[PDB]
Structure 1
Amino acid sequence: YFSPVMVLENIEPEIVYAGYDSSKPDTAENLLSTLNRLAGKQMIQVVKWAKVLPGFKNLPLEDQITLIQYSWMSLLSFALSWRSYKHTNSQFLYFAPDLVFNEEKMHQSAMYELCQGMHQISLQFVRLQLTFEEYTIMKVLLLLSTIPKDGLKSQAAFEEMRTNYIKELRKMVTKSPNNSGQSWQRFYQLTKLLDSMHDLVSDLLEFCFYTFRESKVEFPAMLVEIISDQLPKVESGNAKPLYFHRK
């Protein structure tokens, strides 16, 4: 089918600024509009990254679009967890170099409990001492974690890609079991962490869909397009989360 992990390390998008205006009042509307502005800019980076992701080009365009639309919140939240871990040892939420949340901003954003949920994932990165190689493979698995209930246009091509990235994660933990002791132990800690993202992302999307439909919260064109397509699919039960270990 295929060093694909060395490709993943080299194609990871560069950090982007939020464009946070600290002279404007820190109302929830201003903070959430800033997060949406940042999410839109990051989504352009995600599409460019996915285009050069080994294997992704094999999937038909309709399936590439479906996967990006269903996984956007997972990809962005997992990368937020990574930056928080790398840059602050998971003490703060590192949205961008110019936007680092403390308790004050978590309250001001009107997303305090969701920010605490996010902080709990970054704390798991510290507990596991997650490596960049592990992070990059796991982020590809998140792009491949949510599909239509009735499947994709090219379901077998998708399954081949996801199976091969799972094999890469198993090989990575076989070469490096890290602080978990044995290779199998590491593997199940990583798959348990990947599965835990579905519940956090479901909660993040519920609030995002609420502000999108009831809105001074501004959304960039990139998010208006993704959310307008995704929202009816998620709410009608068409988005099937793939779990390694069923609840």
Structure 2
Amino acid sequence: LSTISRALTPSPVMVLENIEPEIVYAGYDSSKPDTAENLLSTLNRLAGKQMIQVVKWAKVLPGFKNLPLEDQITLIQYSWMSLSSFALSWRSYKHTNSQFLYFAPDLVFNEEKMHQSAMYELCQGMHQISLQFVRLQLTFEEYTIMKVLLLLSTIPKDGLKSQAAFEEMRTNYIKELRKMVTKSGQSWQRFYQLTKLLDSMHDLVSDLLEFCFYTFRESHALKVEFPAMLVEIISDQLPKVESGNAKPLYFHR
């Protein structure tokens, strides 16, 4: 054990900041008409590019790499939607002050786009999270920890290969959050507000997935395109979810 090495080691929070992926661009073609077909296909394309960066992020995520390859794949598949809309809400909060849905720098949604996307209510749900970020003045530190917790929010009804190791890393990250919001009195209130917001993601993600699975099934009739990345994810996720094999983890309720 090195006295120096231990003192110079980055806190998990600092590591989260270092590994956070750079903002990804959607490659949105502004010359094409803003119809549901084009906007949804474009969002799905963006989703793909983002998931590729998410996997690289999870690969170097403290504690995550120590999980069986099998569990890592499962966790990612189960949570990809949760991480997507949560990151969406964050960028919207930071770069727009929650005035718009900042899917990407080249793709910012206003009320109009929301209507044209044919998923207006789902957009309102995600936007409502951003509004909360404003009311709470959420910090980037709290954000990164919470995003990690979401990665570990849905598991197999029966469990992962290394259930013990998983509950460990999870509990450690929860503790990391407690420490953040403490930097008590208003600390306990803060922590509960954040865990309560994390739980609320499940009903939101449930509705987002329902529409995702629907548009996936009717992809041809709707003319909605999906990148191989998402085809790969949804193909395997959809049946597990509809089979009741996905188990949501809550803090309350």
Shared fold, TM over 0.5: yes
Cα deviation 1:70-105 (Å, max 9, x = unaligned): 000000110000000001110110000111001110
Report the Cα offset of residue 59 of structure 1. Answer: 0.4
1-side partners of 2:108 and 2:185: how far apart?
34
Report the Cα offset of residue 174 of structure 1. Answer: 1.4
Q: Name the SS for the 2:103 alignment partner.
A: strand
Report the Cα offset of residue 173 of structure 1. Answer: 1.0
**Structure whose CA Rg is larger:** 2
Q: What are the ranges of 5 or more consecutive residues in structure 2 without an aligned counterpart?
A: 1-10
Tell me which stretches of 4 or more aligned residues in structure 1 moved more than 2 Å.
none
Cα deviation 1:127-171 (Å, max 9, x = unaligned): 000000000000000000000000111100100010000010001
Q: What are the ranges of 5 or more consecutive residues in structure 1 without an aligned counterpart?
A: none
2-side partners of 1:220 and 1:35: how far apart?
10
Shift of the 181–101 alpha-carbon distance from structure 1 to 2, 3 Å rule, reads: farther
Cα deviation 1:2-40 (Å, max 9, x = unaligned): x00000011100001111111111110100000000000
2:247 is matched with which residue?
240
The yes-or-no answer on 1:20 pairing with 2:28 is: yes
Aligned-CA RMSD value: 0.9
Q: TM-score, normalised by structure 2?
A: 0.94
The yes-or-no answer on 1:113 pairing with 2:121 is: yes
2-side partners of 1:186 and 1:87: how far apart?
23
Report the Cα offset of residue 56 of structure 1. Answer: 0.6
2-side partners of 1:225 and 1:18: how far apart?
19
Q: TM-score, normalised by structure 1?
A: 0.96
Report the Cα offset of residue 181 of structure 1. Answer: 6.1
